[PDB]
């Protein structure tokens, strides 16, 4: 019945990073997908050109439409806001949706929430102060003149840093101030959230407070990984995904 995996990334970074674990899921015996969203492909018009939702998250509906039966979508940090909004518009082709220390939010919920400071356990004040906005506040960027500490926050997990083709350079402000769409048939398809338990981008406190939040249950699964588990524990993360594709409503 699910026979497609859809890997969805976070700010500023793009499909490959999930490069360790594709190998993994498809072994499985699934297809994988890890695209870029949006804005996300050098060359293709970076922050500005994402006019919307819809816009932004276009790349993974195109994939949902060619699917041969259902699919597992997982977002990771602010990749959960897209995982969202795509289960409200295609609830026909989505099986099961992972959140990965990702930004779940209450329907009519923005990720703001969780992000800007506030209570209680809201906040992610080690990203605030290393992104940056640029252009008129229309694109965030991240802040170049701290590389060390950008490393230590984001990407520690790596062992070693990653390459190039992981990331972009602006993120479009798009995803932080939608809210969450789903309702009815949505609430439906089973959810589950991977902890991250030493995550400083996101920290656990706030990934609980935002699973606790939500209307209706949440399976979880802890990890001992911060920010970036697809890079410290491909292996583990993999298993954790497709034991949920294999039975979602069950895991």
């Not at 995996?5 to 015996?29: F, Q």
């Amino acid at each position: 019945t699910v026979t497609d995996i859809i890997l969805i990334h976070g700010a500023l970074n793009r499909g490959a990073c999930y490069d360790a674990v594709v190998p993994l899921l498809e072994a499985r015996g699934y297809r994988v997908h890890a695209p870029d969203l949006t804005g996300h492909t050098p060359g293709d018009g970076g922050h500005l050109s994402v006019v919307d939702m819809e816009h932004y998250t276009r790349p993974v509906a195109d994939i949902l439409a060619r699917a041969e039966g259902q699919s597992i979508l997982l977002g990771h940090s602010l990749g959960g806001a897209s995982i969202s909004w795509l289960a409200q518009h295609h609830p026909d082709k989505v099986a099961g949706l992972i959140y990965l220390t990702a930004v779940l939010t209450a329907p009519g919920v923005t990720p703001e929430t969780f992000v800007l400071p506030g209570e209680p356990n809201r906040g992610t004040p080690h990203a605030l102060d290393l992104i940056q906005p640029v252009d008129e506040g229309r694109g965030l960027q991240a802040d170049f003149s701290r590389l060390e500490r950008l490393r230590e926050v984001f990407m520690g997990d790596y062992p070693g840093m990653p390459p190039a083709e992981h990331f972009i350079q602006t993120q479009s402000t798009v995803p932080f101030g939608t809210p969450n769409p789903m309702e009815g048939r949505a609430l439906e398809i089973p959810r589950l959230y991977i902890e991250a338990l030493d995550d400083v981008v996101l920290p656990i406190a706030v990934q609980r407070q935002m699973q606790k939040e939500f209307p209706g249950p949440v399976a979880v699964v802890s990890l001992p990984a911060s920010h970036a588990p697809y890079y410290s524990m491909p292996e583990r993360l993999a298993e954790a995904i497709a034991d949920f594709a294999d039975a979602p409503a069950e895991y």
